[PDB]
Write an enzyme that holds these catalytic residues in place. Sequence first.
Site, PDB file in Angstrom:
ATOM      1  N   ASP A   1       0.810  -1.202   0.000  1.00 18.42           N
ATOM      2  CA  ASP A   1       0.000   0.000   0.000  1.00 18.42           C
ATOM      3  C   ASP A   1       0.847   1.256   0.000  1.00 18.42           C
ATOM      4  O   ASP A   1       0.382   2.311   0.437  1.00 18.42           O
ATOM      5  CB  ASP A   1      -0.929  -0.004   1.204  1.00 18.42           C
ATOM      6  CG  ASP A   1      -1.810  -1.214   1.240  1.00 18.42           C
ATOM      7  OD1 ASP A   1      -2.165  -1.721   0.157  1.00 18.42           O
ATOM      8  OD2 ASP A   1      -2.144  -1.676   2.349  1.00 18.42           O
TER       9      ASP A   1
ATOM     10  N   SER B   1       2.714   7.215   0.271  1.00 23.42           N
ATOM     11  CA  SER B   1       1.840   6.454   1.152  1.00 23.42           C
ATOM     12  C   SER B   1       0.424   6.608   0.628  1.00 23.42           C
ATOM     13  O   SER B   1      -0.165   7.689   0.723  1.00 23.42           O
ATOM     14  CB  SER B   1       1.943   6.940   2.584  1.00 23.42           C
ATOM     15  OG  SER B   1       0.925   6.367   3.369  1.00 23.42           O
ATOM     16  N   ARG B   2      -0.121   5.529   0.080  1.00 29.70           N
ATOM     17  CA  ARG B   2      -1.409   5.594  -0.588  1.00 29.70           C
ATOM     18  C   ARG B   2      -2.570   5.757   0.375  1.00 29.70           C
ATOM     19  O   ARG B   2      -3.664   6.132  -0.061  1.00 29.70           O
ATOM     20  CB  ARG B   2      -1.613   4.343  -1.420  1.00 29.70           C
ATOM     21  CG  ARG B   2      -0.493   4.083  -2.376  1.00 29.70           C
ATOM     22  CD  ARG B   2      -0.804   2.935  -3.278  1.00 29.70           C
ATOM     23  NE  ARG B   2       0.381   2.459  -3.973  1.00 29.70           N
ATOM     24  CZ  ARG B   2       0.395   1.460  -4.845  1.00 29.70           C
ATOM     25  NH1 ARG B   2      -0.724   0.842  -5.176  1.00 29.70           N
ATOM     26  NH2 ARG B   2       1.543   1.018  -5.321  1.00 29.70           N
ATOM     27  N   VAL B   3      -2.362   5.482   1.662  1.00 33.10           N
ATOM     28  CA  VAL B   3      -3.450   5.437   2.631  1.00 33.10           C
ATOM     29  C   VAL B   3      -3.192   6.277   3.868  1.00 33.10           C
ATOM     30  O   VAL B   3      -4.155   6.678   4.546  1.00 33.10           O
ATOM     31  CB  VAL B   3      -3.740   3.974   3.031  1.00 33.10           C
ATOM     32  CG1 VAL B   3      -4.907   3.903   3.975  1.00 33.10           C
ATOM     33  CG2 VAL B   3      -4.035   3.146   1.823  1.00 33.10           C
TER      34      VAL B   3
END
Lengths: 303, 140, 49, 123, 124
Positions: free
Chosen positions: B80, B105-107
């Site tokens: 992720d 950081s995708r989240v």
Amino acid sequence: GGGTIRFWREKLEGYKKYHQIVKTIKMVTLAKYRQTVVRTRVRDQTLRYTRKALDAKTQDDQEVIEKSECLLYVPITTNRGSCGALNTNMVRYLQEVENPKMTIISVGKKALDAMTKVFQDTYRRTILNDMKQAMSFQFAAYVLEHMNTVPWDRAQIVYNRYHGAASQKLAIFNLPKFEDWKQKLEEDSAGDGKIEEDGLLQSLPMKTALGELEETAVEDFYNFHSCLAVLNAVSENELSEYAARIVAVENQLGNITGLMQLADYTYNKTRKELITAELLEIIGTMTAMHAGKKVGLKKTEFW
Amino acid sequence: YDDLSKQAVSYRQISLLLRRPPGREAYPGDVFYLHSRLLERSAMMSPQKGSGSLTSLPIVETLSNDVTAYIVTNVISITDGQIYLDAKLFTGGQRPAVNIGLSVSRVGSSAQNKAMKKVGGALKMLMGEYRKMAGEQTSG
Amino acid sequence: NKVKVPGRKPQDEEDLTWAEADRKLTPEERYARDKQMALLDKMTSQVEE
Amino acid sequence: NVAMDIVEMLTKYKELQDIIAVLGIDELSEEDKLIVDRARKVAKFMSQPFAVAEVFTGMKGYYVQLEDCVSDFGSLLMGQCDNIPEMAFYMVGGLDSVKEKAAKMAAEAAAMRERARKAAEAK
Amino acid sequence: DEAGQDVLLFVDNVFRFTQANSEVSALLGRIPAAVGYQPTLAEDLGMLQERITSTVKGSITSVQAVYVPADDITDPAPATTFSHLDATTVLSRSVAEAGIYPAVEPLECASRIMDPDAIDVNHY
Ligand SMILES: COCCOCCOCCOc1ccc(C(C)(C)CC(C)(C)C)cc1
């Protein structure tokens, strides 16, 4: 995969040859720069009475255009490239300053192809000194004889000033016209001495003593000092060219290095991948042959 | 996990000693599933399941700063996010050698504290400007 | 007024170049054509003289 | 036709990238550097923000309409918009947004100049 | 162990050690994974290197030559050897021709214990 690795190898050899060629250019330019740097110790002394004679307060453009009829801008460009932003910045300054009444007589081959495509009609011609023999007072005389084809009212000689090996800035000499210079000389010789601009020098005694000087000698004074100004411009641009070429060549060598390391990584990557591919092919054909072997007993009589 | 790049070599040993059909970069082809089984177990669970958590910070060894390797992309295709450390900045004294452009950081924006969120937005603008202003001049 | 860049559109100037032809050999070809034209002109004069 | 011309321009820009990365933009003819600036504007314009990537781009997402996309690329193709800087095309949708971004950037650059003037005078 | 003292272990090129184990694995019928190195490269190298460690009873340091094939660091044998190394004594004919002896080039060399957590602060 063989074509890819062969291509990357050819590009590697091309970058290496290109690197050593550019290195040769750097050595030649270094020799010329080490010659011309001897001027740096000795410059900054010949033009001081020329300043005192020709210099005036900073005149805003838009009044000079309305006052005048045919200005002149002499950009001093180079004969060969890999210099940097000198030529481009000169062209940018002139298309920043472009106005209906201008005329451009340049110095260099690179002013020939560029300006004519930006400035169609104002650009006239250029002057070329193949730098086998160093510039001279009569080269600047040639340039004055070319400028005098126009009845110009002001001549802005643009050039590159060598402040240091990492500093080659722009610079200008705003030369007046002879008749206007003489009239300003009289009008400033009459009144008292008062500077109208910080950093400017009073020269009232000079502007009287020149009145003591006869006419032909004053014309010779004007032409002589304008010639010295042009000559200092040519010398400073020569040195600035030879100094900025080294910077614009070492950065090329850095880029070439980076391209070469990428080419090397890709070449070796393709090499290893091709080795693995041939290995897995051979093991696959061998493995298939092994798979084509039966497990049956194939019993036969032994008696 | 220090590190999953070596787990794949061990599985490659196990497979090739069993003469399984190899694949790209000598690996069998099921190494993607091998890492996906492991990484999918790391999750933030629902309140139905206790609202627990299992974070995973795996580690992977590149070669000459090459994200285009097989295992690297196989893990980026699972994870992720990404934290790209650079040997150039490490040798250049910057330690940790995080390259912000190659990292993401995708989240974590949902988890970031608001006090950190504002500072991160400001520094993100600042560094997006700094990366351009540093290269555009090229010592001009 | 700025520049007459070439292109596919009529207001733009002619683009006589060909993407197939290589740019690496162009300077050698330029020098060769210049030298050949000079030799042909000199032969014209020498034939009349 | 606009798409084919855009693709042709980007093809030439790809061929010129081989030289730009080595020597520099200054060693190109005036026509070639104009083509480079235009293709750079085209490539930057091709980017746009999405509503999904709001976490990353930090910008509201746009929905560029088809009819408005062709007129913008054609104006960028005919030289109808060359005074606009390159960064104005980055992460926007539609030429109107490009002009808004150019106005913002010009205002900010001016304001920085007056701020530097005030600091130097107070200095 | 018995004498309770430090030891040096000088190793002529580990490339040839890897090559010998690769030949063994090939003759045994084991599939070459990559360029031609054995699948058990890391295991066979670690079974040697992990024995080269410090202990309460003593220590075995090891200085190991490495031939890099085609000057590619990404080759698996160097790629696995470098992971175990702690220092690099690079040598250069340039400094040697300049009269320097030992012909070490400190800039391109490196070490892992260069940390105040390990050594004293003044040394670092
Ligand atoms: C921070 O502590 C680091 C400690 O590192 C100890 C192990 O050092 C690894 C050495 O890595 C290299 C990488 C490249 C090379 C080159 C490419 C210079 C070798 C060469 C010239 C033989 C091809 C040599 C050693």
